Every structure is written in structure tokens, then in C-alpha cells.
């Protein structure tokens, strides 16, 4: 399947134990896709002061379309030193490894895989 229905645990930035996926744009996109498939991926909603508390490169989920079965269609865009790799819509948040942090909510997405 080109798309997969996922329910992503929304984490508070100060709870996050592993604050990024790795050290290159290609590694963070790779690791993000692997964690999404393995159900070990969390989502941090972007506000003032969030991104400086997380590690670059960043992996964003961005709205790719205007929502099957409640699930917003999203794709991955990485960012390193103000340059993005990918072009997509509005940010739904930044992806991080999930290692058992208690979420505040769940975000239903349809991920272009």
C-alpha cells in the first residue's frame, strides 16, 4: 500500500527522551519511516520554543492534501540549518522516537509511504 493509517501518540516536548532520529537528512527520514512502520514514532506539536529543545535534522509531517476515515494525509519533510528536503503543506508536528512516554493525545494520519 502507498498509504498507511496510523494513530501517532502526541508527546509533550519536555517528556521526550530521544529528541531526534539521527545525524543526516537521509538518516532521519530513514529512521522516521522505520519507527512509523514499527509503531515506535511519536509526534510533538510545533509551537514557540519547541524546535530548539529537539535535535536537528528535524522530521516534520506536513498535510499533503485537503481526510479519509478521520485520517489527515501527510508526508515527511526533513530540515537541517533552515533547508527543507521535500515540499508539502502545513506542519502537523515534528516526529521523534517513542520509548514509552505518556501521550496527551493521538493524531490519526494517512502516511504516504
CATH number of residue 100's parent domain: 2.30.30
Q: What cell numbers appear for 62 in the block? A: 506536513
Torsion sign, CA atoms 18, 9, 73, 36: positive
| PDB experimental method | X-ray
Specify the 3-state DSSP secondary structure of 49.
coil
Q: Where do runs of H (alpha helix) occur along the chain?
A: 25-38
Please tell me the total count of domains within the chain.
1
The residue range of the domain holding 41 is: 3-112
How many angstroms is the resolution? 1.9
Task: Residue 113: count other Cβ atoms within 10 Å of its Cβ.
Answer: 13
Cis, bond preceding 57 (omega within 30 deg of 0): yes
Pick the closest to residue 83 from 65, 62, 56 (CA basis).
Answer: 56
Amino acid at each position: 500500500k502507498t498509504h498507511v493509517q496510523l494513530s501517532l501518540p502526541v508527546l509533550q516536548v519536555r517528556d521526550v527522551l530521544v529528541r531526534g532520529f539521527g545525524d543526516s537528512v537521509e538518516e532521519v527520514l530513514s529512521e522516521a519511516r522505520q519507527h512509523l512502520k514499527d509503531g515506535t514514532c511519536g509526534l510533538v506539536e510545533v509551537e514557540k520554543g519547541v524546535l530548539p529543545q529537539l535535535e536537528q535534522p528535524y522530521v516534520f509531517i506536513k498535510r499533503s492534501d485537503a481526510a479519509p476515515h478521520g485520517h489527515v494525509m501527510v508526508e515527511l519533510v526533513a530540515e537541517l540549518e533552515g533547508i527543507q528536503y521535500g515540499r508539502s503543506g502545513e506542519t502537523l508536528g515534528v516526529l521523534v522516537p517513542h520509548v514509552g512516554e505518556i501521550p496527551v493525545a493521538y493524531r490519526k494520519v494517512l502516511l504516504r509511504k
